[PDB]
Design a binder for this molecule. Structure first.
Ligand SMILES: CC(=O)[N@+]12O[C@]13C(=O)NC(=O)N=C3N(C[C@H](O)[C@H](O)[C@H](O)COP(=O)(O)O)c1cc(C)c(C)cc12
Ligand SMILES: CC(=O)[N@+]12O[C@]13C(=O)NC(=O)N=C3N(C[C@H](O)[C@H](O)[C@H](O)COP(=O)(O)O)c1cc(C)c(C)cc12
Ligand SMILES: CC(=O)[N@+]12O[C@]13C(=O)NC(=O)N=C3N(C[C@H](O)[C@H](O)[C@H](O)COP(=O)(O)O)c1cc(C)c(C)cc12
Ligand SMILES: CC(=O)[N@+]12O[C@]13C(=O)NC(=O)N=C3N(C[C@H](O)[C@H](O)[C@H](O)COP(=O)(O)O)c1cc(C)c(C)cc12
Ligand SMILES: [Mg+2]
Ligand SMILES: [Mg+2]
Ligand SMILES: [Mg+2]
Ligand SMILES: [Mg+2]
Lengths: 334, 334, 334, 334
């Protein structure tokens, strides 16, 4: 009977082994980027509009050819059986039932075909493999299984240095595997190789520089995710939310611009929208819900977010997510 | 024998049931807007003027056709019998005796006619009802009872999500009722309907966007209250005090511009004035005083505020509230 | 054997009755201006210059016709017998011996003539009295006793609201009196009355507005003290150090521009100088030293400040206080 | 088996006598500049670039005619036998083996000739002596011993006031001596005297003012170190990292521009690079490593830094330190 996302963090902390909670919670380095994701959202204040017609508030959007129930998708988080035995299938089922896109990870602990069979028109997150042809096989598999977008993670030439995991000597338990298997630095040529191999929208995840956003458009990306990988890659990378406004201006409608990092309420969703985001991704909260109560947990989380998004939108005078994008903001202190 | 408003918060905390103190104290969401109301005032510093004639310092203003003793009114706070058995009549009597306008709430726990009978030329706060005609009946009742302004709350299409009240499972005790009765989203058309129905000044409460202030003037409002509803509506809404200067400039004397949220001293009143406010509203402190010592409590609070306003004005070289509006300010840190 | 001013605060706290320590330490209201005096100095960073000739570093200045050993004077602090039985004579003797001007208070607990007899060419702080003629008698007395400047306090139409003193019910012990006696709001006309009555330099203390600084020059002031009275007058008044740069620019050498509030080291002196101050006043630290060890205490404090000023100047590449005024600064965080 | 530099601080704290740990850790005054070195780096966020070719990431630079393995040198820290019995020889050996320049101090506790014999093409830090000829003898000795640059410390006309060392009554133990011996304020003429006496690059250490950087170039310096001496000289001096961008712009490639103060990770190195630094110096961390585990300790520290630099560079899309200099940054909060 949770009333905010923080309820679920506590519940997940109680049930998960410490080293697993740390694998989930932690960031790279001193966790400066992890913390900055939160600080950056806290400093954003919305300027609500009043006395608008709210006789049909809708939180729906159209993205990558599909209607979604909220301007939100479940972020790609690897190895979800770490958190609950049903892992990715529990999350995907809840996401489907909520009308929220679910991003299947290259490092999923259940095969992408089994996750896609859940239904819910899922997305597929790609990590570039040591060989172009194995990469492109994942893409084709995803597409053949009915995934509707390829989320190419471009901020992971290699994994960041996570000191929690080093101090814990954390390693996958033997009962969790990379189920899509029986990694190399991506480049712009890799992007092109993917774009040529699929007619699905290619979404580049982990863009923070304005000219990288621009180049993503030029490269034929259908979207980008403005993201510092939840503070888990470069420690000291700017939060996506701090780059988002500038990026949205630069691409000037040329692709969808998503953001992630630290989204913890419908109000946060509203802030991201007001800064110009098409949609957000949510990572850690979904895994807290999964750890706490499995599929039911994720369903309750998504219902809570949905209600908070609708509440925030209406209180801000927005009948639609488009209207929310036209809200103005003001930076405040603490 | 209180020397600041914080004395009365402690006294109210001691006497009220926890769930009632929480209903009063709390805001929506993570209470970001609640806290920001205070932070925003703390960051404002006044640039006082020296060596001016102070041989008749006056704190009086003329507003909505009436002289008021201070640039201050009691904010509309619902269900005041929650805090003290005499509820609204205790507050209204103290306000009358102090020469301070009292705002009667649509959700008052004593009928608007009984409160108005106290005297003191009160204001009436309107919430828009599911039917235009019931709304307009409240207006007419208020007017027939001698209310001198209609404070139309425009930031409440519905009530915000107050997690204290959810976590407490708070509900009105059966001995507190909405005494004006034996709610729909307001729009600009609702405003017009009200404006056409009364010759009293219509004051729109809960304006934060500059173009909403502008439109309020265009709409024939006699005033606005720049307000985030004490942090109880949209969590992450900008504090009114952060919008006030821009709003005052935009309306360029076309209506009175009031502010509220976090006013806790005569010095705060001075800051709001220096930013351009015609007057402030004060909410929670009046309810602390009511809970602590009933009518006497509210009288002591209003006397303390009056003395602090006069002290701050004089120390800043202002013989009048108009002069205080011409003070300059500087933003500082913490 | 103190190495910083904070050593002496602790020592004074140990020896003084609490209510007296509070009378000394406290400010008005919530102590926002008191704290801001410190915060404002902490945020100032100096840009030192290197490789300059330091073969005769001097901390001396010429001010109001006299050489002073440091760009520093002892601020006017009333009733110094509250802190030590020798009161003002202990402080004045130490100041004389250090070559630092001492400001005699209108509310001194030893008569201005006895303090002036100590020697050291002292200044006299004026509070305007209910009658022009009694005010001007104080001035003439001061002058006849060999005071070299009149420091007219202009930020005290009346005393601020000090909640420590109210909560303590603090009052002068019967053994401390206003020894110059056997108060009205000052105006610009009062200033003129003083200026016409003495050929001593008139220094207006408690100026914070730029146009008040300008007008002080126009009025024939020989100096001003940019000051919020140590946070003891208007609570929420800007710190002097935040106004100083703008004020120095505006007066454009037309009078000496002193600053006070929170000066606690030679480094602070350097910051004030770099912002354009002619000199600083130091209040509370001198009273800590007095309370801790009487005349000897004040001598040790002034020796410590002198050494810290010389050290800071040299490390910043300044052979003279003039050179220090030409240093640049940068605002930092915390 | 350390995973960050903070591991080594704890280890050094455990093993060193308190007064020695304090001599190492402390700064001048209230330690404002010491703390600001850290704060200033924490506020810098990097804008990483994605999808660049990383098939030969190199951390090497060419500086002062030599290839270095990292854009990093060991800062001049006096009396290193205070921390470990092998003192400077332990550090120099580790630095040589890591391919990192080591700066030999004028106040080294082992003679400059013995340190230089370790190999590793070392630099020599000069303090100006009371007599030009003794100064220039040190220079010539350094050069004759195969030092490759003279790091002239120009921010030490005399040593700052370190209150830890005063409160501890700290003094060199009799078993630590200034081994180069059997001090006067430097000026621009001193610089010239040095420049005329050696063909080695002269690097001026402790420049913070832009026009001092400019003048260093004009003076024929081959480099500068933008530095507040680790917060140990002027308390309230701006951090070097806050001046670096402006200084790099002003010198416009006319000399190498190094920075130091608070560098505690490869990410910090990356930030300094992105602000335009040619290289950084690292002081206290190297001494922690020395105290913790002697030569082995310093080797582990330099290996950890090397890995963190390579990791940060790659994650930011930089194949080279030059590319890292072309990264953009954004200031954030806390
Ligand atoms: C590389 C990695 O370390 N992984 O599993 C990815 C991955 O394999 N593929 C990828 O593309 N992203 C990953 N993320 C980042 C995620 O997608 C979001 O960017 C942030 O979670 C949003 O911030 P949040 O909402 O959590 O504050 C992520 C996040 C967490 C919590 C874990 C445990 C693993 C990962
Ligand atoms: C909706 C609501 O939740 N109510 O009861 C209103 C309401 O019925 N009609 C309305 O117009 N305003 C309401 N307020 C906001 C009030 O008017 C001021 O805006 C802030 O109190 C100023 O900030 P403060 O001085 O307290 O810091 C309010 C305030 C409190 C404390 C309670 C318990 C109830 C309410
Ligand atoms: C009015 C008053 O309340 N008095 O006694 C004055 C006064 O009678 N005449 C006046 O002109 N100033 C007074 N001050 C302000 C003083 O001169 C400096 O402005 C600040 O002390 C600098 O900040 P500081 O260095 O202390 O941080 C002052 C200061 C203290 C600590 C006490 C106990 C009494 C006073
Ligand atoms: C004067 C002095 O007090 N000494 O020994 C110098 C010196 O004799 N010659 C010089 O030129 N510099 C010195 N430093 C500053 C050092 O070179 C770096 O500027 C900072 O250490 C970088 O910041 P950090 O990485 O430590 O945060 C320094 C540093 C420490 C920790 C000690 C104990 C002694 C010194
Ligand atoms: Mg997120
Ligand atoms: Mg208020
Ligand atoms: Mg002072
Ligand atoms: Mg460093």
């Amino acid at each position: 009977t949770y009333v905010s996302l923080a309820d679920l963090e506590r519940a997940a902390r109680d049930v998960l082994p410490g080293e697993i909670f740390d694998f989930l919670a932690g960031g790279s380095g001193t966790e400066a980027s992890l913390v900055a994701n939160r600080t950056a959202l806290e400093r954003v204040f919305v300027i609500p509009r009043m006395l608008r017609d709210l006789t049909d508030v809708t939180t729906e959007i159209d993205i990558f050819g599909r209607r979604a129930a909220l301007p939100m998708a479940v972020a790609p988080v690897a190895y979800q059986r770490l958190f609950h035995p049903e892992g990715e299938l529990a999350v995907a089922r809840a996401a489907r039932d909520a009308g929220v896109p679910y991003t299947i990870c290259t490092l999923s602990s259940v095969s992408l075909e089994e996750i896609a069979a859940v239904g819910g028109r899922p997305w597929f997150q790609l990590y570039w493999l040591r060989d172009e042809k194995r990469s492109l096989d994942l893409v084709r598999r995803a597409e053949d299984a009915g995934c509707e977008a390829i989320v190419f993670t471009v901020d992971v030439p290699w994994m960041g240095r996570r000191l929690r995991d080093m101090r814990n000597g954390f390693a996958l338990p033997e009962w969790v595997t990379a189920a899509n298997f029986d990694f190399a630095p991506a480049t712009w040529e890799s992007v092109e190789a993917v774009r040529a191999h699929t007619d699905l929208p290619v979404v580049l995840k982990g863009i923070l520089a304005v000219e990288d956003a621009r180049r993503a458009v030029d490269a034929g990306a259908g979207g980008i995710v403005v993201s510092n990988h939840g503070g888990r890659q470069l420690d000291g990378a700017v939060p996506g939310i701090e780059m988002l406004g500038e990026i949205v201006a630069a691409v000037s409608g040329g692709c969808e611009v998503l953001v992630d990092g630290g989204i913890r309420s419908g109000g946060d969703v509203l802030k991201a929208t007001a800064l110009g985001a098409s949609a957000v991704l949510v990572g850690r909260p979904v895994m807290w819900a999964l750890a706490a109560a499995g599929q039911d947990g994720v369903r309750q989380l998504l219902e809570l977010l949905a209600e908070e998004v609708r509440d925030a939108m209406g209180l801000a005078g927005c009948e639609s997510v488009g209207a929310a994008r036209r809200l103005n903001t003001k930076l405040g202190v603490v």
